[PDB]
Design a protein around this nucleic acid. Structure first.
Ligand SMILES: Cc1cn([C@H]2C[C@H](N=[N+]=[N-])[C@@H](COP(=O)(O)OP(=O)(O)OP(=O)(O)OP(=O)(O)OC[C@H]3O[C@@H](n4cnc5c(N)ncnc54)[C@H](O)[C@@H]3O)O2)c(=O)[nH]c1=O
Ligand SMILES: [Mg+2]
Ligand SMILES: [Mg+2]
Lengths: 553, 413
DNA sequence: GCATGGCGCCCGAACAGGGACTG
DNA sequence: CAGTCCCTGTTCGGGCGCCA
């Protein structure tokens, strides 16, 4: 029974305890479960309860890593609804790439960790449960937890929290030891003599026992191939644990999830990973079991990546004396890849970034987003933002940030040549083009019928109007600009009362999710001098007027 | 110091703050660790567990000439929900004279609040969590035991003591104005700059007699110009120019009702060419100048309304210039300025905007003793990533992000 | 009638806000 | 002026990955 002081817990005002009945279990389960409760009973983890306790919560079991034994869980879902909130302390997950090299290293793990911290007394009642007989022919036995149960939303937090308080004393008196605690999984590293270390490890392992924390000898002792957080930490490198992709003929939705999930975990270190085609399959709303025909474009990816994982890589460690560099490359349309290293090819961590934000953007923008993403992620791992090497010319960027209306910025970065390169695919003109047919575009639709017209009317005399089906006053506006762009030469002067359209265009987008806007872009690339100007909408302006009367019959 | 803590009531039915903490650079994590462990020993704060559902983010900043770091908590939230308490019940008056003084300086008396203890029940709401690099460890949680800095309540509870502390100074120098905005103290006078600085220094000492550590910076409310909109002066007018012009006039027309343009409109009549030059007609010349006069005379209908939220907009110009407008309702500007190419700021659009924002927030405090809500012209993740590296004030304004291309170029610049 | 906390990625629904149009 | 639309951005839930 642990001396560690318990943490006061209450339920939400007006809510009583859980009164949900136990659902029947399987023969083997009821079998293992009773072997467990018996052992907990004696140890003092749980307690046999009288009939005066009106509560109950269904319980069940699940096999562990090597499938020797079982894990007793409790479906405290109803209890989590009623119980008080907590504020979580685990803010993130440690990364091997942020690990430093150390003379000696060890990694322990507290056995049965939850079952060694005292649950607040008053709360225990609500944690009551029942275990049936073999075939439910004799009333079962009521029990309640006196320790942290598995399935209560408060556990992980209380535990993690109680653990740091126990390690606080030891960590202060040993400022020279670095310890990474994640739940009950400890990693102790030091630059102490190989033997002195083993002494601290003993001095420590014996510190937990004093606080009730067991330390089974089943732990990485002077074992270079350390298994921490699903990684293989070697003396001067680190890798991820064997990563096996699902291999099957017919794929269901869920199957693909379980496939992309893993490929992302891979991107952490395997470079060049891409999952854009693969996930596209997940569009629309579909069931986990809905079987979906693997597409052609995705078949390329699913295979491409599979070729990448065939040839294993490894990660290196970090040292504070050298700055960090993160180089990035543009992998597909919308996709990007990046690797952070401290030396030439000495990689410390790789990564993918593929969120195509917004309806319309451009490589510069999507690039800027990636730098930001990496900048942040690196501050979490190393607490300092790294140096960049980006595939974009210094003059390109400088052309963009001065012209763009939003404030924008990229930290310390040098150039790197590796196609494809980022660049603006065109540039509207600052001043009107001399000696050029000027198009006065506009359009409109009757939002009540979806019918609509789009057209232009030039100074030279040109003129046209096109009827449209299923369109809106905004789309129309665009459509119109499309026409004026087609029916023009390499130099053009277009004018519109469309703040919307003008909005998109000026941002120099090079990709979009809009058919129409994709075509406009394409056409804009083909010209040599474009110039769009804006005028008030239903003013009597010169040319606008006319096209207006035309488009709205 | 055993004292009777004023009870802090909360907005009825208000849930305390629950904000996640954000990543922190190594240098500012180690600064925060140091800062907090001494605060823990000095008893200002107390360690706590995960049983306290609340939370507010923390970070830290190093200001000008101060090598010592300063802790800063974003009680931006806990302030919106305790507003009843500090604006109504224990409100503190705003002198409308300060905006008129020849010189004003800002002192950091925030330290002084650490003296008074905080009401036991309200402590759980000031909870904060310190992160660890590479998540070597879970978050360490702390809560305040004394008036913290950053909460709008603190300067409201300490007003009684402040009145006193400053009573003898207001007597000997009945011609200076003191205003207390949160962690700040704003002292304004019409004295000459060299002696003004000394009155500030006799005041700093005056605060020393009670134990308050008061660690281009002087302000000048009289030198702040509300620069208006102006129309260009061209020799020959192109069709394009006359267009853009109307574009602006029709727009600026929502401001003043007098601007007419129907006379400048008849000029474009008929699909012409953009580069086509057009003779400057007299029907226009009259009305053009006619409008040019309306835009000089100050807009009629301006008025401040304490009962309404203040709003600031900034436009990015280029070459380091920025323009802003503070208002409560569309087209009824209270003031509009033009932040210039700050001599010393790097070519960092974000570092610049960050600076502009703090100027506005400051001007805003002096003029109406209230902070504005900003409409920043930058993308959230872009700003969210670097705004803290450049911040140097002790308060944080409520901002929202907006993206809106430039119609009629920028009428304001 | 098959649990909990954390972080990541990806997709979509719900929601909010500004400009243009409509009666 | 107030009520509809359309377009768009931001938030939050659910599912998978990985850890405990
Ligand atoms: C996996 C899991 C964890 N948890 C919560 C509650 C749980 N505490 N408890 N009880 C705590 C830690 O779980 P852990 O898996 O460490 O088990 P626990 O702390 O319960 O006890 P113990 O560690 O003794 O677990 P066993 O399954 O009995 O032993 C397996 C352990 O032995 C070590 N081990 C065995 N063989 C080796 C080897 N060759 N090399 C290195 N380590 C080894 C290894 O760390 C593994 O966890 O996280 C949860 O809520 N749900 C889950 O599904
Ligand atoms: Mg364990
Ligand atoms: Mg129109």
């Amino acid at each position: 029974i642990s001396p560690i002081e318990t943490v006061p817990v209450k339920l939400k005002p007006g809510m009583d305890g859980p009164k949900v009945k136990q659902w029947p279990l399987t023969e083997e389960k009821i079998k293992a479960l009773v072997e467990i409760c018996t052992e907990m009973e004696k140890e003092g983890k749980i307690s046999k309860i009288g009939p005066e306790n009106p509560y109950n919560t269904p319980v069940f079991a699940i096999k562990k890593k090597d499938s020797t034994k079982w894990r007793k869980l409790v479906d405290f879902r109803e209890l989590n609804k009623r119980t008080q909130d907590f504020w979580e302390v685990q803010l993130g997950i440690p990364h091997p790439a942020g690990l430093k090299k150390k003379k000696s290293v060890t990694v322990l793990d507290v056995g049965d960790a939850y079952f060694s911290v005292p649950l607040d007394e008053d709360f225990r009642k609500y944690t009551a449960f029942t275990i049936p007989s073999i075939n439910n022919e004799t009333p079962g036995i009521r029990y309640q937890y006196n320790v942290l149960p598995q399935g209560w939303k408060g556990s992980p937090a209380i535990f993690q929290s109680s653990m740091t308080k126990i390690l606080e004393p030891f960590k202060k008196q040993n400022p020279d030891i670095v310890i990474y605690q994640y739940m009950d999984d400890l990693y102790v590293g030091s630059d102490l003599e190989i033997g002195q270390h083993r002494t601290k490890i003993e001095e420590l392992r014996q510190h937990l026992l004093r606080w009730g924390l067991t330390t089974p000898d089943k732990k990485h002792q002077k074992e270079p191939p350390f298994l921490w957080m699903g990684y293989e930490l070697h003396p001067d490198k680190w890798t991820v644990q064997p990563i096996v992709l699902p291999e099957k003929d017919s794929w269901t939705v869920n199957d693909i999830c379980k496939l992309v999930g893993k490929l992302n975990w891979a991107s952490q270190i395997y470079p060049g990973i891409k999952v854009r085609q693969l996930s596209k399959l997940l569009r629309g709303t579909k069931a986990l079991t809905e079987v979906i025909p693997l597409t052609e474009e995705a078949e390329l990816e699913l295979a491409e990546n599979r070729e990448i994982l065939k040839e294993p890589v490894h990660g290196v460690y970090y040292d504070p004396s050298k700055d960090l560099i993160a180089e990035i490359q543009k992998q597909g349309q919308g996709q990007w890849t990046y690797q952070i290293y401290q030396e030439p090819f000495k990689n410390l961590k790789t990564g993918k970034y593929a969120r195509m934000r917004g309806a319309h953007t451009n490589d510069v923008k999507q690039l800027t987003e990636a730098v930001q993403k990496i900048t942040t992620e690196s501050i979490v791992i190393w607490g300092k933002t790294p140096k960049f090497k980006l595939p974009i010319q210094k003059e390109t960027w400088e052309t963009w940030w001065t012209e763009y209306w939003q404030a924008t910025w990229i930290p310390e970065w040098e150039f790197v040549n590796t196609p494809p390169l980022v660049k603006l695919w065109y540039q509207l003109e600052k001043e009107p083009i001399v000696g050029a047919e000027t198009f006065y575009v506009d359009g409109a639709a009757n939002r009540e019928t979806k019918l609509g017209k789009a057209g232009y009317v030039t100074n030279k005399g040109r003129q046209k109007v096109v009827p449209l089906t299923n369109t809106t006053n905004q789309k129309t506006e665009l459509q119109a600009i499309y026409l004026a762009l087609q029916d023009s030469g390499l130099e053009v002067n277009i004018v519109t009362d469309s703040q919307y359209a003008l909005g998109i265009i000026q941002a120099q987008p090079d990709k979009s999710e809009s058919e129409l806007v994709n075509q406009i872009i394409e056409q804009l690339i083909k010209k040599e001098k474009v110039y769009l100007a804006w005028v008030p909408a239903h003013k009597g302006i010169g040319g606008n007027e006319q096209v207006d009367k035309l488009v709205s019959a | 110091s055993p004292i009777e803590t004023v009870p802090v009531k909360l907005k009825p039915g208000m849930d305390g703050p629950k904000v996640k903490q954000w990543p922190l650079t190594e240098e500012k994590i180690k600064a925060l660790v140091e800062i907090c462990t001494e605060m823990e020993k000095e008893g200002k704060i107390s360690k706590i567990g995960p049983e306290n559902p609340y939370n507010t983010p923390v970070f830290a900043i190093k200001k000008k000439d101060s090598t010592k770091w300063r802790k800063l908590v974003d009680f931006r939230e806990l302030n919106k929900r305790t507003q009843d308490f500090w604006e109504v019940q224990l409100g503190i008056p705003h002198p409308a004279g300060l905006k008129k003084k020849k010189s004003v300086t800002v002192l950091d008396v925030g330290d002084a609040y650490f003296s008074v203890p905080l009401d036991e029940d309200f402590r759980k709401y000031t909870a904060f969590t310190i992160p660890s690099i590479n998540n070597e460890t879970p978050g360490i949680r702390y809560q305040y035991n004394v008036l913290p800095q950053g909460w709008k309540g603190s300067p409201a509870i300490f007003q009684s003591s402040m009145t006193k502390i400053l009573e003898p100074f207001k007597k000997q120098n009945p011609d200076i104005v003191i205003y207390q905005y949160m962690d700040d103290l704003y002292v304004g006078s019409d004295l000459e700059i060299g002696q003004h600085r000394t009155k500030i220094e006799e005041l700093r000492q005056h605060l020393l007699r009670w134990g308050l550590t008061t660690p281009g910076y002087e302000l000048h409310p009289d030198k702040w110009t509300v620069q208006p909109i102006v129309l260009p002066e061209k020799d020959s007018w192109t069709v394009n120019d006359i267009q853009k012009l109307v574009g602006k006039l029709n727009w600026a027309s929502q401001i003043y009702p007098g601007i007419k343009v129907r006379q400048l409109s008849k000029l474009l009549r008929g699909t012409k060419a953009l580069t086509e030059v057009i003779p400057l007609t007299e029907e226009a010349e009259l009305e053009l100048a006619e409008n040019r006069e309306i835009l000089k005379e100050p807009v009629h209908g301006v008025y401040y309304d304490p009962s309404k939220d203040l709003i600031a907009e900034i436009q990015k110009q280029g070459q380091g210039q920025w323009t802003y407008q503070i208002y409560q309702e569309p087209f009824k500007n209270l003031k509009t300025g033009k932040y210039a190419r700050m001599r010393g700021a790097h070519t960092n659009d974000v570092k610049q905007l960050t600076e502009a924002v703090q100027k506005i927030t400051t001007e805003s405090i002096v003029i109406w003793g209230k902070t504005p809500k900003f409409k920043l012209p930058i993308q959230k993740e872009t700003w969210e990533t670097w705004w803290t590296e450049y911040w140097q004030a002790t308060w944080i304004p409520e901002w929202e992000f907006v993206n809106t291309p430039p119609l009629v170029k920028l009428w304001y610049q």
